Design an enzyme around this catalytic site. Structure first.
Site, PDB file in Angstrom:
ATOM      1  N   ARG A 107      12.067  -3.689  -4.056  1.00 22.03           N
ATOM      2  CA  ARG A 107      11.979  -4.647  -3.248  1.00 22.03           C
ATOM      3  C   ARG A 107      13.227  -4.819  -2.345  1.00 22.03           C
ATOM      4  O   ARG A 107      12.951  -5.065  -0.841  1.00 22.03           O
ATOM      5  CB  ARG A 107      11.485  -6.036  -3.665  1.00 22.03           C
ATOM      6  CG  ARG A 107      10.707  -6.885  -2.617  1.00 22.03           C
ATOM      7  CD  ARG A 107      10.335  -8.201  -3.144  1.00 22.03           C
ATOM      8  NE  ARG A 107       9.239  -8.989  -2.043  1.00 22.03           N
ATOM      9  CZ  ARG A 107       9.240 -10.113  -1.635  1.00 22.03           C
ATOM     10  NH1 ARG A 107      10.427 -10.947  -2.224  1.00 22.03           N
ATOM     11  NH2 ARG A 107       8.325 -10.437  -0.838  1.00 22.03           N
ATOM     12  N   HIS A 136      13.087  -4.706   1.888  1.00 18.65           N
ATOM     13  CA  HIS A 136      13.377  -5.871   2.449  1.00 18.65           C
ATOM     14  C   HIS A 136      14.672  -5.793   3.279  1.00 18.65           C
ATOM     15  O   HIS A 136      14.499  -6.191   4.463  1.00 18.65           O
ATOM     16  CB  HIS A 136      13.589  -7.377   1.756  1.00 18.65           C
ATOM     17  CG  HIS A 136      12.288  -7.959   1.531  1.00 18.65           C
ATOM     18  ND1 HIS A 136      12.225  -9.191   1.341  1.00 18.65           N
ATOM     19  CD2 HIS A 136      11.096  -7.462   1.624  1.00 18.65           C
ATOM     20  CE1 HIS A 136      10.831  -9.514   1.085  1.00 18.65           C
ATOM     21  NE2 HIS A 136      10.024  -8.244   1.335  1.00 18.65           N
ATOM     22  N   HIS A 173       3.233  -2.398  -5.006  1.00 20.80           N
ATOM     23  CA  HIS A 173       2.881  -3.697  -5.813  1.00 20.80           C
ATOM     24  C   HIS A 173       2.385  -3.465  -7.171  1.00 20.80           C
ATOM     25  O   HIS A 173       2.110  -4.319  -7.767  1.00 20.80           O
ATOM     26  CB  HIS A 173       1.854  -4.702  -4.802  1.00 20.80           C
ATOM     27  CG  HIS A 173       2.656  -5.395  -4.082  1.00 20.80           C
ATOM     28  ND1 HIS A 173       1.994  -6.231  -2.824  1.00 20.80           N
ATOM     29  CD2 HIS A 173       4.102  -5.459  -3.683  1.00 20.80           C
ATOM     30  CE1 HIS A 173       2.936  -6.696  -2.297  1.00 20.80           C
ATOM     31  NE2 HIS A 173       4.168  -6.374  -2.583  1.00 20.80           N
ATOM     32  N   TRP A 212       0.626  -7.617 -10.902  1.00 23.07           N
ATOM     33  CA  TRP A 212      -0.671  -6.889 -10.308  1.00 23.07           C
ATOM     34  C   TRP A 212      -1.423  -5.959 -11.248  1.00 23.07           C
ATOM     35  O   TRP A 212      -2.436  -5.413 -11.067  1.00 23.07           O
ATOM     36  CB  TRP A 212      -0.109  -5.911  -8.993  1.00 23.07           C
ATOM     37  CG  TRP A 212       0.225  -7.001  -7.916  1.00 23.07           C
ATOM     38  CD1 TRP A 212      -0.390  -7.503  -6.630  1.00 23.07           C
ATOM     39  CD2 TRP A 212       1.765  -7.205  -7.423  1.00 23.07           C
ATOM     40  NE1 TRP A 212       0.282  -7.934  -5.708  1.00 23.07           N
ATOM     41  CE2 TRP A 212       1.683  -7.808  -6.114  1.00 23.07           C
ATOM     42  CE3 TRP A 212       2.908  -7.325  -8.092  1.00 23.07           C
ATOM     43  CZ2 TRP A 212       2.693  -8.414  -5.576  1.00 23.07           C
ATOM     44  CZ3 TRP A 212       4.081  -7.856  -7.722  1.00 23.07           C
ATOM     45  CH2 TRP A 212       4.063  -8.050  -6.349  1.00 23.07           C
TER      46      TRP A 212
HETATM   47  C1  HEM Z   1       2.085  -7.132   3.849  1.00 24.51           C
HETATM   48  C2  HEM Z   1       3.098  -6.840   3.166  1.00 24.51           C
HETATM   49  C3  HEM Z   1       3.744  -7.061   1.995  1.00 24.51           C
HETATM   50  C4  HEM Z   1       3.647  -8.422   1.580  1.00 24.51           C
HETATM   51  C5  HEM Z   1       3.297  -9.575   2.259  1.00 24.51           C
HETATM   52  C6  HEM Z   1       4.494  -8.513   0.426  1.00 24.51           C
HETATM   53  C7  HEM Z   1       4.592  -9.618  -0.273  1.00 24.51           C
HETATM   54  C8  HEM Z   1       5.050  -9.927  -1.608  1.00 24.51           C
HETATM   55  C9  HEM Z   1       5.340 -10.996  -2.518  1.00 24.51           C
HETATM   56  C10 HEM Z   1       4.699 -12.500  -1.911  1.00 24.51           C
HETATM   57  C11 HEM Z   1       6.074 -10.851  -3.598  1.00 24.51           C
HETATM   58  C12 HEM Z   1       6.315 -11.730  -4.671  1.00 24.51           C
HETATM   59  C13 HEM Z   1       7.666 -12.217  -4.524  1.00 24.51           C
HETATM   60  C14 HEM Z   1       8.118 -12.824  -5.611  1.00 24.51           C
HETATM   61  O1  HEM Z   1       7.268 -13.938  -6.058  1.00 24.51           O
HETATM   62  O2  HEM Z   1       9.032 -12.506  -6.511  1.00 24.51           O
HETATM   63  C15 HEM Z   1       6.165  -9.184  -3.651  1.00 24.51           C
HETATM   64  C16 HEM Z   1       6.882  -8.492  -4.534  1.00 24.51           C
HETATM   65  C17 HEM Z   1       7.131  -7.290  -4.445  1.00 24.51           C
HETATM   66  N1  HEM Z   1       6.814  -6.455  -3.279  1.00 24.51           N
HETATM   67 FE1  HEM Z   1       5.917  -7.012  -1.538  1.00 24.51          FE
HETATM   68  N2  HEM Z   1       4.884  -7.193   0.040  1.00 24.51           N
HETATM   69  C18 HEM Z   1       4.440  -6.392   0.909  1.00 24.51           C
HETATM   70  C19 HEM Z   1       4.868  -5.153   1.230  1.00 24.51           C
HETATM   71  C20 HEM Z   1       5.597  -4.410   0.264  1.00 24.51           C
HETATM   72  C21 HEM Z   1       6.047  -3.197   0.129  1.00 24.51           C
HETATM   73  C22 HEM Z   1       5.942  -2.507   1.771  1.00 24.51           C
HETATM   74  C23 HEM Z   1       7.000  -2.830  -0.720  1.00 24.51           C
HETATM   75  C24 HEM Z   1       7.682  -1.727  -1.041  1.00 24.51           C
HETATM   76  C25 HEM Z   1       7.413  -0.493  -0.722  1.00 24.51           C
HETATM   77  C26 HEM Z   1       6.882  -3.856  -1.419  1.00 24.51           C
HETATM   78  C27 HEM Z   1       7.345  -3.876  -2.679  1.00 24.51           C
HETATM   79  C28 HEM Z   1       7.511  -5.139  -3.608  1.00 24.51           C
HETATM   80  C29 HEM Z   1       7.843  -5.147  -5.142  1.00 24.51           C
HETATM   81  C30 HEM Z   1       8.440  -3.886  -5.779  1.00 24.51           C
HETATM   82  C31 HEM Z   1       7.608  -6.201  -5.298  1.00 24.51           C
HETATM   83  C32 HEM Z   1       7.966  -6.999  -6.784  1.00 24.51           C
HETATM   84  C33 HEM Z   1       9.517  -7.810  -6.751  1.00 24.51           C
HETATM   85  C34 HEM Z   1       9.887  -8.055  -8.203  1.00 24.51           C
HETATM   86  O3  HEM Z   1       9.172  -8.144  -9.165  1.00 24.51           O
HETATM   87  O4  HEM Z   1      10.832  -8.862  -8.241  1.00 24.51           O
HETATM   88  N3  HEM Z   1       6.243  -5.003  -1.235  1.00 24.51           N
HETATM   89  N4  HEM Z   1       5.821  -8.747  -2.365  1.00 24.51           N
END
Ligand code: HEM
Length: 291
Positions: A45, A49, A172, A188
Site C-alpha cells: 500500500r 499511495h 486488496h 478481504w
Molecule cells: C478505488 C481504489 C482504492 C480504494 C478506495 C482503496 C481503499 C483502501 C482502504 C480504505 C484500505 C484500508 C486502510 C486501512 O484501514 O488500513 C485499503 C487497504 C489496502 N489497499 Fe487499497 N484502495 C484502493 C486501491 C488500491 C490499490 C490500487 C492497491 C495497490 C495495488 C491497494 C492496496 C491496498 C493494500 C495492500 C491494503 C491493505 C493495507 C494494510 O493491510 O495495511 N489499494 N485500501
C-alpha cells in the site's frame, strides 16, 4: 515538469538486489506486525499511495520524488497507517543510504508482492528525491465509499483503464481494513499475506450483506468474516468491471500478468526513462536465491 530517471551513481542490478534482499529478510523477520499479517500488505500500500498521487495532466505527485518523507504527505489522512511501512524501511535506508526515497518506497512494494508469492514485477531505478515544495497536497488518493463511476473516473487521472483498475484492485487480497485508520474494518479474505486472486473469488462467491461498521460506515460483510469496501463491491455492480473480475477469478496466471504490468506502470507514471537507461530489473526472491 519532466522527471528523468537518473541511476544512483555507479549502481547496477546487484546493488538493488541487495536492497531487495534486505527488505525481504526484514519482512521475514518482523513477522508479528498487524497480528502476524506482517509488513507485506502495508508495504504494497505504501508503494501504491506514494505513486498514486500522480496527476497525468501536469505530472505532479507520483513516485519519482519520494515526497511521502515530508510531513504534508505522511500526514495525509488517506495515508493513515503507512507510517508503519515507512518505519520498516528506515533501517533499510540507513543501510543503503544511496538509494533514493522513491526508489525505496516503490521497491518495497515490488519486494513485498514477490516475497508474498505474487508475480514478478519488473522494476526500474532512477527516481530522484525532490524538495518539500514538490509534495502534492492531500486529497489525491481515492475515497472508498463511492461507486463504479467514481472509481473509473478516479483512475483515469492515473491513466488506468478498466482492466488495469480491476487488476490493481486485486491487491486488496492483502492485509485488511483497520477501523481507526480508514473507518472500515476487516480482511478481504483468508490468504491476506500471500498474493493470490482471492479478492475476485470472494467478490463473486461470498454471500455479501451491506452492513454498517462501528464507525457508522457501510461496508459489505460475509459470514466468513470478510469484507469489501463499497468501491470493491462496485467492481461487480458495474457490468464492465464484472466481466474482468470473472476473468481474474478464473485465471490466476492472467491476473498475475496483468497485475504485474499495471503495478509497474503505476510505480513508473511520471518518469521519463532515457533511451539508454538500464532495462528493468527482475529481482530474484529470497527463495530463488536459497536465502
Ligand atoms: C478505488 C481504489 C482504492 C480504494 C478506495 C482503496 C481503499 C483502501 C482502504 C480504505 C484500505 C484500508 C486502510 C486501512 O484501514 O488500513 C485499503 C487497504 C489496502 N489497499 Fe487499497 N484502495 C484502493 C486501491 C488500491 C490499490 C490500487 C492497491 C495497490 C495495488 C491497494 C492496496 C491496498 C493494500 C495492500 C491494503 C491493505 C493495507 C494494510 O493491510 O495495511 N489499494 N485500501
Amino acid at each position: 515538469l519532466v522527471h528523468v530517471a537518473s541511476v544512483e551513481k555507479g549502481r547496477s542490478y546487484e546493488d538493488f538486489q541487495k536492497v531487495y534482499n534486505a527488505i525481504a529478510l526484514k519482512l521475514r523477520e518482523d513477522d508479528e506486525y498487524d497480528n502476524y499479517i506482517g509488513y507485506g500488505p502495508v508495504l504494497v500500500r505504501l508503494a501504491w499511495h506514494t505513486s498514486g498521487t500522480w496527476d497525468k495532466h501536469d505530472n505532479t505527485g507520483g513516485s519519482y520524488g519520494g515526497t511521502y518523507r515530508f510531513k504534508k504527505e505522511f500526514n495525509d489522512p488517506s495515508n493513515a497507517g503507512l507510517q508503519n511501512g515507512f518505519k520498516f524501511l528506515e533501517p533499510i535506508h540507513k543501510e543503503f543510504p544511496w538509494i533514493s526515497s522513491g526508489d525505496l518506497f516503490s521497491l518495497g512494494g515490488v519486494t513485498a508482492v514477490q516475497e508474498m508469492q505474487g508475480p514478478k514485477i519488473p522494476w526500474r531505478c532512477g527516481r530522484v528525491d525532490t524538495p518539500e515544495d514538490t509534495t502534492p497536497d492531500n486529497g489525491r488518493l481515492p475515497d472508498a465509499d463511492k461507486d463504479a463511476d467514481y472509481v473509473r473516473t478516479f483512475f483515469q487521472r492515473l491513466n488506468m483503464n478498466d482492466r488495469e483498475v480491476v487488476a490493481l484492485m486485486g491487491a486488496h487480497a492483502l492485509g485488511k481494513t483497520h477501523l481507526k485508520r480508514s473507518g472500515y474494518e476487516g480482511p478481504w479474505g483468508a490468504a491476506n499475506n500471500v498474493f493470490t486472486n482471492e479478492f475476485y473469488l470472494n467478490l463473486l462467491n461470498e454471500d455479501w450483506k451491506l452492513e454498517k461498521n462501528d464507525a457508522n460506515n457501510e461496508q459489505w460483510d460475509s459470514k466468513s468474516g470478510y469484507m469489501m469496501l463499497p468501491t470493491d463491491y462496485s467492481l461487480i455492480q458495474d457490468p464492465k468491471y464484472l466481466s474482468i473480475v470473472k476473468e481474474y477469478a478464473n485465471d490466476q496466471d492472467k491476473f498475475f500478468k496483468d497485475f504485474s504490468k499495471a503495478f509497474e506502470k503505476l510505480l513508473e507514471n511520471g518518469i521519463t526513462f532515457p533511451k539508454d537507461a538500464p532495462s528493468p530489473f527482475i529481482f530474484k526472491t529470497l527463495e530463488e536465491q536459497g536465502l
